[PDB]
Write a protein that binds this ligand. Structure first.
Ligand SMILES: C[C@H](Nc1ccc2ncc(CO)cc2c1)C(=O)Nc1ccc(Cl)c(N(C)C)c1
Ligand SMILES: C[C@H](Nc1ccc2ncc(CO)cc2c1)C(=O)Nc1ccc(Cl)c(N(C)C)c1
Ligand SMILES: C[C@H](Nc1ccc2ncc(CO)cc2c1)C(=O)Nc1ccc(Cl)c(N(C)C)c1
Ligand SMILES: C[C@H](Nc1ccc2ncc(CO)cc2c1)C(=O)Nc1ccc(Cl)c(N(C)C)c1
Ligand SMILES: O=c1[nH]cnc2c1ncn2[C@@H]1O[C@H](COP(=O)(O)O)[C@@H](O)[C@H]1O
Ligand SMILES: O=c1[nH]cnc2c1ncn2[C@@H]1O[C@H](COP(=O)(O)O)[C@@H](O)[C@H]1O
Ligand SMILES: O=c1[nH]cnc2c1ncn2[C@@H]1O[C@H](COP(=O)(O)O)[C@@H](O)[C@H]1O
Ligand SMILES: O=c1[nH]cnc2c1ncn2[C@@H]1O[C@H](COP(=O)(O)O)[C@@H](O)[C@H]1O
Lengths: 326, 326, 326, 326
């Protein structure tokens, strides 16, 4: 019964696992990092920048797309403002671009202006995607724009993933509570350790033949490959990209050291009724996006070389982990 | 045998678990936070302030009741003094009030004056409620005042809970060793990690159709919902409320920062023969009770929205957890 | 096979367990703390001070015996010097006294002078008691002095305990690696977490009807009751008693704060060929032995009151624990 | 299936285990520390210094060999430079010496000059030895020089070990990610906790009757004996030897304290395309190699005395561990 199964489940995070090295005949420089997210969207690297007001606006989306990745333009701005940012990305050599939409009544206006601006992928981005509001919005957006790649989230269970894909989503975004600036676990007591959330959701996605985005909690390149090997098609980054020059914030100095503001979309500052679910902090200035992406992808290339993985499909389907203690 | 089963049991604390998000068609603002503790006592929020000399006197009991909660007037004062505090709460618009009683010979005098003062709930509050002294006091108080709501504790086992409810208690208070200022675990080597203590005691309480109060160890709003989802009908708070303006202590300044004194009822200072079982410390001034209660209940509302819980009964009976490592 | 069973065993320390509260009809002040170590030796409290040059000489042995406990005069001094210390203890009202002996060739001379001085218990104290040298010394000492209570150690296994009791030891002392100043685990990679070491050794001792001393790793009163409840008849203390006025060292001041020197018997300073197995450090001045013993025994009394244990036999045979995470 | 077994494996590190003390009739001074690595190579102590530019050049290889150990001359220098270092070691009384070779095209030239210089053991040292490049190099080196002792690595699995021994390696070197200066786990998300890596690889090596070198992650003498007892024939040290006078770096002063530079062979500084897999740091000056080796071997002697191990073979085949928590 439900009473008896209350504590049956046990879950794993990035720090609980390591990839086991395997027979390899490939050098890190020769591995294939490309991923087919939908029949219309292919990325050259499995990295997506987060739809956050301290992470992705036009500058970040352009630089990400230039590296073979993707940017999610945040929705904490006017509808025409969001459309204008998408337009600049499209004007920068026809680069791919994504944009976040909600479930509020203004969504129909927002979705229309973004599609008119040339957006390639719409992201129904909510704190809790296993809801009637999200499922109905997935159906409406897919019915209205059947030629637009649709991401829906955030989820952390197989049942939620099944419901989003069945409602018409092309991609399901995974992550309830793992974020660096996230206080969801502390404030609401809810969450699923990210490695188990990815694995459970990817187990379901394999039945549908559709992709998942592993969103949140990635601290280093090692966590990227672990996220992909657990079942994620691509990863979403907030913290690792917030300190780059290309993020929306201004570079400020403090006691001789340069910093950039990084905040949760559920923080008081971002929300300006709901109690905060994110913090506002200062992160070290990391220089250009180009440098950070190269170091992170180099780490992924090393791990694929250790696992004998020629491409991401082989890494997802064959790579093995070991569990460990602290 | 007893020798062979010495280390069979394994227990969980708040930090070992998280609630799993589920299908939801309800917004945090629309969830129902009310709880029926007894046929005569209904709270609008599942929060009770602790019977401690640095937490609850008339001011705290009035503010708590005003928020839909309850206050437990501490017994570390004269019998007529305790009766006077209850009287002020009753004079403040007929608000609900509780008062702590012991097992000492002066209890008959104390219980009579509190009942005459209009007390709604008597709390037989001891460090160890699974005792002959407590069970006999439960029988006596219930026989003398059958119209008064009776809480008895503290316990951490199913057998203890069964014995207290069978002796005539309406509500059983759960918590042996989890408190913030508590040194019971360190000093006496006794205790049950609070999530397992709640679950084991609520498993028994379900058979009797009676309520349990999850007492101690709550550090944030996330721990409140975890305490309720593990089986608690309401939670008891010490640390989270000690820094509010409404607590009995005076606001003192230290190096430009404001603080309030918070101490265990088993500390040297509070006890003024038994060796101390609590510490005396300084806690950050948090301002008004009203602000702290709103932030804590907002966090509970978010978690119920993630779990799809419309009310606390559904959260207790259906919500699922996951276990995790450090 | 031995290869396949290399990592089969799993062990518990003090910090992994807590005692479960049980039905109680006894107040902490009324519990019985006495223990029958041998037909000739009964203690009023289950506490023995360690045979260490920074813990027990005549002053500590007198004060310990006065509290109902026992002191082990260390052997890092001349044979006649050790005999002189035992003599002072016996001259102080016929109080009980113990003295440490080794396995070296000078032991016959040392054992004779200590017995002539009126020693009640001889302690064959070695870093590794599961050895041919110790077993032969047990046989020799018991054959020579059949009327003297004989302790032999240190061990951490059932097979070792069985071998020491069968060789003629009356009491087996348990503890390989748990000490506060001990570097045995770090230096030699050997040890058994103390709760499992006590339990495994007490499981064997129950078959022989003989006592065990739980030696090392006790940081607070809570660890004392856990040590006894896991199967120990009495506990041995080093760290908790080193800072008392009665320990052999002189009280020294450092930046306005008083300290006492505490060192392992395997430290460079104590040993003055073997590489050190203990450190030399400064511990906080705790005042009189009388005060420390009262606080520690008060904590034990509280735990026995929570467990419903009237005496130590009931605590050893019936008390139950719960395991927990960090 | 591969999908279902993704998280089946669980692994142990040095800090998760302790050796269980056993029946002993041997003193630490009388234990035998010698090991037969190949029919041509016998060491008097089971210690090999690492092939790193901050650990082993001629000075370290001479001192190590003088203690009964072995040094691995690093390959981050000219072919004739490496040959010159080997020559100095051979000129110092015919002491044993080892030298590292890669899988690059210049290897044939390097291997020939080292063999001509009198090298006793060639070490095919790579970050990932379970590769086509390494296996082919093992075959080539063994075919060319059948009279030279050949080490191949690094590996962490039974299948990898089997493949290296079958290709013709005499000794397999174990260690993927455990190093002190190693960022492989963090950067590439790959690794096997070292105790399990040794055990799994030694399980396979027992079938072939060949030796394994436990490489990396040893912080103290206790970790050396644990590494050997888990199945390693000898251990390889980097961190523990980097601070000795005999290491290639120069002794530098910082705020009155002496330090030596210690860096990973995958650090930016050492590599001077691949992203770094090691850090560059300052380690405390430990004085002479002779002193450090004596303290480390003394600790190993103590542990063998506790386990009753007369020699390393008995320690590998019979010694038992216990698992524990943090
Ligand atoms: C204040 C908080 N803010 C955010 C903002 C962005 C987020 N982005 C991702 C995640 C995933 O942990 C959580 C987030 C929370 C938030 O929206 N809570 C929240 C909690 C429960 C429910 Cl049912 C809902 N529904 C969407 C109404 C919203
Ligand atoms: C000194 C200590 N003080 C307190 C005071 C308030 C407490 N309130 C709650 C809890 C729960 O950990 C413990 C508390 C200990 C205390 O009463 N110990 C204590 C220990 C064991 C037993 Cl059997 C008893 N019985 C009631 C006689 C009392
Ligand atoms: C240096 C060290 N010193 C001490 C001194 C007192 C101790 N007292 C207790 C314990 C228990 O961890 C260890 C101790 C180590 C020590 O004696 N090691 C040691 C290690 C292994 C063996 Cl087989 C032996 N045998 C007695 C010859 C001695
Ligand atoms: C940059 C790094 N540097 C080093 C250098 C020395 C090392 N020595 C030992 C270990 C074992 O963790 C790792 C090391 C990494 C390195 O070589 N990575 C690396 C990663 C994956 C593969 Cl498949 C390969 N193959 C040999 C081409 C190399
Ligand atoms: O305030 C917030 N609360 C909880 N999660 C958040 C919040 N803001 C953003 N997130 C999530 O955290 C991710 C960033 O994770 P990070 O890379 O670990 O910093 C975003 O992509 C969101 O899914
Ligand atoms: O001195 C004490 N020792 C042990 N527990 C205490 C003491 N004083 C109060 N408590 C308990 O700790 C609770 C407060 O827990 P907190 O909210 O974690 O601070 C109270 O409601 C009591 O049940
Ligand atoms: O140098 C040493 N190495 C290891 N154990 C030691 C040493 N000296 C004393 N011990 C043990 O540690 C105990 C004291 O433990 P403590 O009370 O945790 O400080 C003594 O009774 C001895 O059994
Ligand atoms: O940069 C590096 N990355 C990873 N492992 C390294 C690196 N450099 C050396 N190692 C390994 O780490 C070992 C030294 O380990 P340590 O004794 O724990 O410092 C060497 O013998 C190598 O196997």
């Amino acid at each position: 019964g439900s009473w008896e199964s209350k504590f049956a489940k046990e879950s794993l995070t990035f720090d609980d696992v390591l990839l086991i090295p395997a027979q390899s005949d490939i050098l890190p420089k020769d591995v294939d990092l490309s991923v087919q997210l939908s029949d219309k969207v292919k990325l050259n690297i499995p990295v997506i920048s987060a739809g956050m007001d301290t992470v992705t606006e036009s500058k970040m989306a352009i630089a990400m797309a230039r590296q073979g990745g993707l940017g999610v333009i945040h929705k904490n701005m006017g509808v025409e403002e969001q459309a204008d940012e998408v337009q600049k990305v499209k004007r920068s050599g026809g680069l791919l671009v994504a944009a976040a939409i909600g479930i509020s009544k203004d969504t129909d206006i927002r979705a229309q202006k973004l599609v008119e601006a040339g957006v390639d992928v719409l992201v129904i981005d909510t704190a809790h995607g296993h809801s009637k509001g999200v499922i109905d919005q997935v159906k409406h957006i897919k019915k209205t724009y059947p030629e637009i790649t649709l991401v829906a989230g955030n989820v952390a269970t197989a049942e939620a993933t099944k419901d989003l894909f069945e409602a018409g989503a092309d991609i399901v975004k995974v992550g309830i509570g793992p974020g660096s600036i996230c206080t969801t676990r502390v404030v609401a007591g809810v969450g699923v350790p990210q490695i188990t959330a990815i694995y459970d959701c990817a187990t379901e996605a394999r039945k549908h033949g559709k992709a998942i985005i592993a969103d949140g909690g990635i601290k280093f390149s090692g966590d990227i490959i672990k996220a992909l090997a657990a079942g994620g098609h691509a990863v979403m980054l907030g913290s690792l990209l917030a300190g780059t020059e290309e993020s929306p914030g201004a570079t400020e100095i403090f006691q001789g050291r340069q910093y950039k503001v990084y905040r949760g979309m559920g923080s008081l500052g971002a929300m300006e009724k709901f109690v905060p679910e994110g913090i506002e902090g200062r992160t070290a200035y990391k220089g250009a996006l180009q440098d950070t992406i190269y170091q992170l992808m180099g780490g992924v290339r090393a791990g694929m070389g250790y696992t004998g993985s020629h491409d991401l499909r082989e890494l997802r389907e064959e790579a093995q982990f070991t569990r460990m203690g602290p």
